[PDB]
Ligand binder design. Structure first.
Ligand SMILES: NC(=O)c1ccc[n+]([C@@H]2O[C@H](COP(=O)([O-])OP(=O)(O)OC[C@H]3O[C@@H](n4cnc5c(N)ncnc54)[C@H](OP(=O)(O)O)[C@@H]3O)[C@@H](O)[C@H]2O)c1
Ligand SMILES: NC(=O)c1ccc[n+]([C@@H]2O[C@H](COP(=O)([O-])OP(=O)(O)OC[C@H]3O[C@@H](n4cnc5c(N)ncnc54)[C@H](OP(=O)(O)O)[C@@H]3O)[C@@H](O)[C@H]2O)c1
Ligand SMILES: NC(=O)c1ccc[n+]([C@@H]2O[C@H](COP(=O)([O-])OP(=O)(O)OC[C@H]3O[C@@H](n4cnc5c(N)ncnc54)[C@H](OP(=O)(O)O)[C@@H]3O)[C@@H](O)[C@H]2O)c1
Ligand SMILES: NC(=O)c1ccc[n+]([C@@H]2O[C@H](COP(=O)([O-])OP(=O)(O)OC[C@H]3O[C@@H](n4cnc5c(N)ncnc54)[C@H](OP(=O)(O)O)[C@@H]3O)[C@@H](O)[C@H]2O)c1
Ligand SMILES: [Zn+2]
Ligand SMILES: [Zn+2]
Ligand SMILES: [Zn+2]
Ligand SMILES: [Zn+2]
Ligand SMILES: [Zn+2]
Ligand SMILES: [Zn+2]
Ligand SMILES: [Zn+2]
Ligand SMILES: [Zn+2]
Lengths: 359, 360, 360, 359
């Protein structure tokens, strides 16, 4: 069987025929892969930056069901939930390894579990999300979107501690969000916050790309060029109710944006920072205390969030047709090894989502 | 100005030109009506089945176009007014939530205290206006009915947070089953939104499915039960439900029939406004409700956040359920086609989901 | 071993020595009974009003002393067993919460599947044991009944989070009024806990107050209503309630009487297990429930966190309401005083709150 | 009228007769003060560290109602809520200026509002908490305890984001709390967490005082001497589900205790740090992200929390009689000016609560 394989914690990837008999199987439903998606976590594994001799790569997949089994029909498109329970703690037991208390959960194509960049795989109905044909084109995005659905869901649940966090009209329309970092995570955060009616500011250290500009216009989102800092934003707009870190960046970005957090506000840590150290002085922290501010680490969506992601992706073909068309950067054939290896090892400038097609 | 008007104790409806000076104005934004919708409350008022003013403008379902760029609203934007507005006194109303008004002294447009929206144009306050994207103009009139249901289901899920774990093995609610009694617009919209949330649905009506219901069945993967001879056969083959919605305008004895089909920790959602009957509640039924943590909840009125959720869900349905979505508007009537207009105002058509009025 | 035993379809109760080998053991901790409490469920079983085993040990209310230092439990500690234990299958039971058991296949000690606690000693699992401080030994038997009520009120407040603002101008619930129908231990404990939370309370019984009720009235600042002639006079003078608790074991027609006294957004808490009657629910009553967001909720069973809250609240009452607290134990009977013991098991005394059994 | 007055932002305090006619009045109920309490905020104002020529000091008070008015009877003991709404935002409007969005709320004896160290004052029923005579002796503590009730209430509400944060028995008994800093805030946090059934560790850079030792024994609380750091605690006990900063300290304490925070855990910032700067490296922050950790600033209890505080103080006379007796360090006469001025300007070693008696 053709698979895309890695041999961790060593760097490198191959695109090759492997023994289907040594690959991990997860239940009785056979699924023939049609698309994979590639993200930074995939790049990391390829560049060694993170029984079996190899691991199958990939945690973003849509496949087709080959024969009807119980809930699922032949020809149904499905997406597997990539994070799976440790089998021990109460969070995993209730289907919620995003809150696993042992850290011993499985991750498809990362840890303890062959991924899904392979011709086909066997999975269990309980881990499969139905992907309506009507969103087949952008449906691969339900996986990453799922983390963000979980994040926004959580940030809203936490904000229930504030007696009234709604506006005069009963909505969250008057709440402002600063999303730092564009890239597929910042873009998805923006789209989903806009869907919920909040006002959003996107910030990058540069002017917008064409995708971002289309996002601005179509969703009525604001953009702030943050190359010389945040002072002008705070002077022009004042403070934000929610701030999302969506950069894989130097934690010092947190020093820059923390002073833009408003009363009762939330700083959502979602990006996985790779460099730096950020000083917090006593005046900063005492202010956090005085104004009921919260900082929260945001991670991993589970099945309910994949299903939310599907409904939202569906709404975005209606509401935001032009942005939705720009979500998929390009599709690369599983058969074009040179171009595949290239996209696998490296992100192109301003990439949203690279897709793998198995044909 | 052209207006559809009623003279509220009395039966009667007229489509005539009326003195604009006399019509309630609610703010600074001028909006030219393009669509109204009609519901059973309109019919009821039209047949007299329900203050210095001679007449009342009918109608609480409206889309209009913003005449002149105002603050946040562009010349040309479609908007929908929130029909229930606060009593100005209680804490729920002051936070934008008269659906939970504590005085009961709230305003209802086209119904009580408030001229409605079946008139050429009106003035409003932005805080009462929901933006309707052009990409959902065709079925967007449905955001007003759907708002009540978004609120009812949001509430049902908030209430069920009393159960330590009401989610399923996979972390979802896909294993929860909803029985929806009553088809037609409320029943149909409950089904679609519960399916959208991923729950299993049975619609039930004392008859075989209409064309629209059959379409939803097939497109949404929904189950149907002919309840003409009661519920014994549904109980025996499917068992009990986690949620039951009364969406019938029916006789309250309906509850005596569906209550035995309520499962452990389940919710009976009373949404329909019953207009006849008395239902006996035996001590064994009642002490079973006690032993099994059952809840009966009266469900009423969506507000602005729910209109906005309705908008997002109508938009998802155009993609996800394209055949059912395009069948939610039964037909459009011109304001200038008087004979037909008068007929749709007076009575409902068999299998009608929504009749829309277009202003030309 | 000395044990109070019953032979569950049948009426009859005996206090005799029984084969220890035959009694259900639940874990590794040995506990010597010092107190039992008696409630109406015991009486019911004793009068036959409700598996390789000949007899069942009665009683679900117990304090014992830890015989031998175990893990977390010191030789000499008082403990109380949680009486309802999970079915081992469903998600609610697996998180320690069989009060919301989805199979209904839970165990109940001294009642069904499970030998009770009216026996000299038993073995248990620490996860089922609540620590009873010595400073509340006198009234600590009450933590078992109070646990059901802590759970019912916790639930009522969780449910009322559906209302955007259910707090008062001062940010509290002091302006919310509770009607408690039924006095005696459940009604009395509901009153005390709702007062503890700061809400206004009216107790109601079809008679003038007993000595104990009068004491609570005065000490807790609670209101009383003689309901002998219905509720019209309470409605006319006080108006409507935000919460009404049925704590009567009564006839379900009681609900037909108190339902008109439920206010907007209010909750009818069904806690009492009614054993006769059929109550008619008219369409106007039902559509009013709809328009005003009313909720009817079946209230059942406290679990461990609620026993522990009960413990904290019993302790607060010794300070805050010292006269009422010392009247919650009506009297203590010796296990060795058989004639009297048999009488308290068979029937309740007028105005009894709690009869305690002491093991000597 | 005798009052204890300050002339902000200048340092200094006087104990003297003032013109009752220039003092702030808040409603129609007249209250003759009996006790005040003194805390660090009072010390700060006295040492200038933070129409009218002076402000009456003090936000901790119990008084007696002089005549029956509406709800309140002659002889009823009452405590005023010290923080009061800005009159503009929705949080204040619902009685919750702990979440005020303008920052323009009033604070008795600090800001915009004469305090309560004065012979008597006029207040509004809506701001008054009933103090049962049965807890008159320790009842002054309801004010500070109120902030902590609000804090624990909030930390628990936030933890509802975790699908199951309860233990196998349905309780929070298996959850561990680290309370850093003893002193009245750390002590009250400890007592209240123990009341809720959680296991608690108190930490100071020294061995326990007599009060603390009585707290340990009577509540079955643990103590860790943290003078040489937290490594031995983490080695012996492992990680904590909740960590409370109750020190007025150098923010660097946060660097020391953050690595003791466990999965899904909460760091509650309650103390107002006065010195220092704390570096957060990328490995620390990325870990926060991976494990759904939250940091939250904790501030101010309102009327419902004062009423909770009363019920708990009442339970603690039953449950923890010896600790409860040690809560009041000493009572000082309003008439002993030298000793009053002394306690007003400075905290004595290991002080829990100094009381002022008006006789
Ligand atoms: N927590 C979770 O569950 C979860 C799940 C998935 C991913 N993630 C993490 O989310 C982060 C974002 O992922 P992604 O795939 O969108 O990353 P990406 O493709 O690397 O995009 C990151 C964005 O940040 C921008 N950026 C870099 N430095 C910045 C700065 N100082 N200020 C403002 N913007 C800056 C970049 O600009 P350019 O467009 O010019 O390159 C880029 O658009 C990554 O660390 C990833 O690992 C977390
Ligand atoms: N709570 C709120 O805030 C709110 C808001 C809006 C509307 N409502 C109420 O909701 C109810 C339904 O509204 P609607 O517009 O959908 O009314 P509708 O158009 O009359 O539809 C009612 C449906 O109930 C079916 N039905 C009647 N009796 C039944 C029975 N015994 N068993 C099963 N099905 C039965 C009807 O059958 P056929 O199709 O064969 O005629 C019809 O399909 C009304 O009472 C309305 O006043 C409440
Ligand atoms: N849901 C649960 O988890 C749970 C747990 C425990 C108990 N319960 C149930 O709760 C109920 C009460 O328990 P209990 O121990 O307090 O019973 P109880 O000792 O019999 O007390 C019942 C009270 O109701 C009063 N009462 C009876 N009919 C009344 C009426 N029509 N109007 C007003 N008051 C009336 C009685 O009057 P007098 O004092 O003059 O006789 C008595 O004061 C029982 O049904 C019991 O089975 C439920
Ligand atoms: N957020 C709010 O709403 C609110 C309300 C009231 C008070 N506060 C703040 O809470 C903080 C605590 O107040 P308090 O009155 O209890 O303060 P306190 O009397 O100054 O006690 C502080 C405690 O921290 C200990 N400590 C100092 N440095 C430490 C370190 N590095 N590690 C461990 N412990 C250390 C001290 O030990 P010793 O006993 O030897 O002196 C003392 O017991 C203050 O900053 C106060 O302003 C906040
Ligand atoms: Zn990915
Ligand atoms: Zn796990
Ligand atoms: Zn309508
Ligand atoms: Zn109102
Ligand atoms: Zn009992
Ligand atoms: Zn169970
Ligand atoms: Zn203070
Ligand atoms: Zn404010």
């Amino acid at each position: 069987m053709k698979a895309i394989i890695v041999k961790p914690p060593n760097a490198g990837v191959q695109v090759k025929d492997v023994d289907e008999k040594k690959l991990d199987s997860y239940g009785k439903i056979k699924i023939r892969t049609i698309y994979n998606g590639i993200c930074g976590t995939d790049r990391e594994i390829v560049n060694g930056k993170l029984g079996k001799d190899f691991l199958v790569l990939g945690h973003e997949a849509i496949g087709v069901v080959e024969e009807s089994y119980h809930g699922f029909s032949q020809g149904d498109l499905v997406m597997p939930v990539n994070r799976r329970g440790c089998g021990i703690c109460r969070n995993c037991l209730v289907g919620r390894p995003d809150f696993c208390e042992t850290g011993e959960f499985g991750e498809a194509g990362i840890h303890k579990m062959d991924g899904f960049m392979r011709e086909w795989w066997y999975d269990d109905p309980k881990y499969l999300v139905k992907i309506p044909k009507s969103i087949e084109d952008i449906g691969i995005l339900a996986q990453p979107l799922a983390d963000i659905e979980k994040s926004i869901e959580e940030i809203l649940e936490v904000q229930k501690r504030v007696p009234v966090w709604t506006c005069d009209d009963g909505t969250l329309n008057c709440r402002k969000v600063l999303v730092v970092g564009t890239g597929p995570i910042g873009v998805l955060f923006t789209l989903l916050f806009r869907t919920y009616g909040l006002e959003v500011w996107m910030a990058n250290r540069r002017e917008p790309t064409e995708v971002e500009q289309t996002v601005i216009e179509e969703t009525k989102t604001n953009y702030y060029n943050s190359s010389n800092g945040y002072d002008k934003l705070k002077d022009s707009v004042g403070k934000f109710d929610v701030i999302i870190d969506a950069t894989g960046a130097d934690v010092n970005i947190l020093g820059n944006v923390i002073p833009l957090l408003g009363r009762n506000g939330v700083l959502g840590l979602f990006g996985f920072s790779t460099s730096g150290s950020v000083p917090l002085d006593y005046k900063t922290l005492q202010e956090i205390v005085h104004t009921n501010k919260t900082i929260i680490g945001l991670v991993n969506g589970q099945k309910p969030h994949f299903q939310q992601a599907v409904v939202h992706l569906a709404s975005w073909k209606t509401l935001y047709p032009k942005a939705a068309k720009m979500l998929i950067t390009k599709t690369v054939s599983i058969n074009d090894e040179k171009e595949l290896l290239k996209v696998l090892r490296e992100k192109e400038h301003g990439e949203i989502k690279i897709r793998i097609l198995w044909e």
